[PDB]
Amino acid sequence: MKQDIHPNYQPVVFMDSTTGFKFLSGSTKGSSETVEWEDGNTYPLLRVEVTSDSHPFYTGRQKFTQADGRVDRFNKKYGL
Amino acid sequence: GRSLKKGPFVDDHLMKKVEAQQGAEKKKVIKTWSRRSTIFPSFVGFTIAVYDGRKHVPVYIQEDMVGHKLGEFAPTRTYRGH
Amino acid sequence: NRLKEKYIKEVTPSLVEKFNYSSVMQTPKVDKIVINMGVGDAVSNAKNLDKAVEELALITGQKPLITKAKKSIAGFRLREGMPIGAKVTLRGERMYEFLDKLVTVSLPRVRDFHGVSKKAFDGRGNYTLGIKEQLIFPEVDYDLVDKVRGMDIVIVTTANTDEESRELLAQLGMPFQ
Amino acid sequence: RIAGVDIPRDKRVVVSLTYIYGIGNTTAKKVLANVGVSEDVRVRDLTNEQTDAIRAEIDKLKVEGDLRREVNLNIKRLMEIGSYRGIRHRRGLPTRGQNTKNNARTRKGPTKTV
RNA sequence: GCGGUCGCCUCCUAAAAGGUAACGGAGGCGCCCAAAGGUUCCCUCAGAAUGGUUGGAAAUCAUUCGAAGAGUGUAAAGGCA
RNA sequence: UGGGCUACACACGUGCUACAAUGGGAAGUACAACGAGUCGCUAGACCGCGAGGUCAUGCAAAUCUCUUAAAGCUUCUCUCAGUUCGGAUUGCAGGCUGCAACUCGCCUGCAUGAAGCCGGAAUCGCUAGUAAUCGCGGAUCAGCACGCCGCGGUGAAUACGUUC
Ligand SMILES: [K+]
Ligand SMILES: [K+]
Ligand SMILES: [K+]
Ligand SMILES: [K+]
Ligand SMILES: [K+]
Ligand SMILES: [K+]
Ligand SMILES: [K+]
Ligand SMILES: [Mg+2]
Ligand SMILES: [Mg+2]
Ligand SMILES: [Mg+2]
Ligand SMILES: [Mg+2]
Ligand SMILES: [Mg+2]
Ligand SMILES: [Mg+2]
Ligand SMILES: [Mg+2]
Ligand SMILES: [Mg+2]
Ligand SMILES: [Mg+2]
């Protein structure tokens, strides 16, 4: 790998702030904040909104009523 | 819209007409002038010939159409561009 | 490295079992990842190409190769050789880390994400995912970007069939529809 | 940020939230009241805890892509049943009884002097 | 007479050496390159199929098919992987 | 009985809302007049985010109600952004009136958030409690007005002059 041309690349642990699940990868992004890690090391911490451990499609668990047929809607609206 | 307490509306004669045909494996066209009649669940599978002002346009009532008035499927004006 | 460990420990035996491989060498692996940013707008303004190159470099951790029109075209207007489009090649640890980020963070951040296509296989076991919009990668900073651009991420594997490629990618983590 | 939309960082939190499709002023005020967040605080100054609580409250709602899908599904359903409303949607004419001899620009598009 | 032509290069005419005419059939030249030369090293094309955001027949990317169907500054013939 | 008079590639009249900071939003507080009311105006209470609903009260009225008017004034916020401007359009869910709201009513709530950055040629009204601006009531009216008639609140600039 040629020297002095590529972007700075350092290890970094990122966390899905919704669930707190964290794990380590590499990125060109850094943070003014850092955290420790297993194996006994410290890495910059990158906060993330969503990951595979929280995204509805990944988890399979839905969050709505899956719509309602119009016949059922009619019967519910008019108590029939 | 129409107050909930009143419940849905359908002309009684039309409701009787559909009731008479509820027990029909092969249903027959139901001719009506009652555009104001709502589409009830029992209407599904029927074909209602709604008067549009000059002729009875047949409308096949699928279950997706419930909640709508009959006249919503019988346009009264014909416009083909200028 | 975590994704590599997954591949070596859990994925490999499972693939061998499923596809009845005589030798471990037959186990498919992700050979390389080629991420290409097609920038035809460079003709109208090169600064767009410069910013696209910068963004791709930030995403991948490597300086991209700035490709040039190999042929001259009228509606695309390159007396052959003008710099339209760029790419990056990832292998080994960098490739595995980038793929892990792609599966675990970047894709979840796609607007109204319902998985990834399942017919997007070349027919020889190489997959390619078309990102419509950047900013799904945390490095993009979502403000330095002036024009939203996408990319094509080609995962080239040693699999001989799209079946094997799909199995490998699913086991490595791929939200197929 | 919150729903995949980067709300203005320097606006007060209610105004920033309003930029989320499916959230109006009333909805933003309601979610902030439920979470316990003062409306005057600029979003840039929000703490991570506040942002996470806001994200949970918003996720409780239907917003953004799903809301667009639902509304478009309703319009498509009208079109496909072929109601008067569906035909109005199809031909870009007012659907709620407005007169079309004049005005109706919002649906018709810019006037074609021809 | 008027019209056309006058020097050089390539093909056919040209009759399997060479050469061979016509106011015979077709085209070019009066340059260009400071690398588009020499050498060392390295590389192999054109298209097609499929997949892939902007992107469409066709820009960039990937895999297979692909013996030359490309390229060789500039006409043609010969030659060159 | 139903439909149409409500159509819609367009052209032109008359109005409403806007394009913002002399403003938007939030909160507090003050001052009218003209008119209408019996199966009609409806107090007060409770329910509902609101439209409104229920119970129920006075009044054929200088007695009760519609009716604590809005601009206004005092603070807080917003900070020039097609925005906390705008409110078209559309989705959903509702309240009424009516036998009935699809053609084809008004209004409310949530959601959405259009063009629009002060307007070419040209053209209109106005000389004072006038223009501008702010509300209020009434007729027709089961329900349906940015239109008309009427009422008051605040409230200016300009007129050298008769050549055109
Ligand atoms: K109409
Ligand atoms: K008009
Ligand atoms: K008007
Ligand atoms: K103010
Ligand atoms: K109606
Ligand atoms: K004007
Ligand atoms: K009235
Ligand atoms: Mg919003
Ligand atoms: Mg109308
Ligand atoms: Mg010879
Ligand atoms: Mg010879
Ligand atoms: Mg050469
Ligand atoms: Mg009649
Ligand atoms: Mg008329
Ligand atoms: Mg402005
Ligand atoms: Mg006078």
Q: Are C50 and C64 in contact (CB under 8 A)?
A: no
Residue B16 to residue D87: CA distance in whole angstroms: 31
Q: With touching defined as 3+ CB pairs under 8 A, do chains A and C touch?
A: yes
Residue C58 makes CB contacts below 8 A (sequence gap 6+) with A7, A28, A29, C137, C139, C140, C141
In whole angstroms, F46 C1' to B40 CA is: 37
Residue C171 to residue C14: CA distance in whole angstroms: 9
Instruction: Find the closest chain D residue to C142 by CA distance.
Output: D6
Question: DSSP readout, D23-88?
Answer: --HHHHHHHHHHHT--TTSBGGG--HHHHHHHHHHHHHS--HHHHHHHHHHHHHHHHHHT-HHHHH
Backbone angles phi, psi at C115, to 5 degrees: 95, -165
* Intra-chain end-to-end CA distance of chain B, in Å: 35
Nucleotide nearest B9 (Cα, C1'): F100
Q: Are D83 and B50 in contact (CB under 8 A)?
A: no
Taking CB atoms and an 8 Å limit, are D65 and C112 in contact across chains?
Answer: yes
Give contacts of A1 with chain C, Cβ < 8 Å: 62
Q: By what method was this entry solved?
A: cryo-EM
Q: Is the CB of C30 under 7 A from strand E?
A: no
Instruction: Classify A4 in phi/psi space as left (phi over 0), alpha (psi -120 to 50) or beta.
Output: left
- Chain F bases closer than 7 angstroms to a protein Cβ: 1-13, 77-79, 83-84, 88-106, 109-114
In whole angstroms, E18 C1' to C164 CA is: 69
DSSP state of A45: E
Polymer length in residues for chain C: 177
Give contacts of A60 with chain C, Cβ < 8 Å: none
Q: What is the resolution of this structure in A?
A: 3.1
Q: Are D32 and D18 in contact (CB under 8 A)?
A: no
In 3D, which of C32, C47, C146, C129 has the Cα closest to residue C89? C32
